[PDB]
Amino acid sequence: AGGQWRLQQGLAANPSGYGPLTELPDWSFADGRPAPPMKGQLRRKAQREKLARRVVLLTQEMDAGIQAWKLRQQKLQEERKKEHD
């Protein structure tokens, strides 16, 4: 319940989704030594990193997909204007 309101505020609809409560470590050593990263957090972290690399690669490919069109138009444009002798 309450997912719609949470979305309105920009937060995750499910409190168990993306948030500091879930993401942050749940404990630490009494001596103050940092706790090891959570296996679930690491697994979730890996997927986000993989998606980020894909997103960058796609945009790079997309940039060429449109930019190349301009380079093929320049080839077409220059081809039209031709002369010799």
Partner: peptide, 28 residues
């Protein structure tokens, strides 16, 4: 992964209460 008898600190507390007062995190 923690040996028995070793004290550890829980880092996620959202509410603490006393006899005549209480404190609530937003959300922590």
């Amino acid at each position: 992964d923690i040996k028995c008898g070793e004290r550890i600190r829980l880092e996620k507390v959202l509410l603490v209460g006393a006899d005549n007062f209480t404190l609530l995190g937003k959300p922590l």
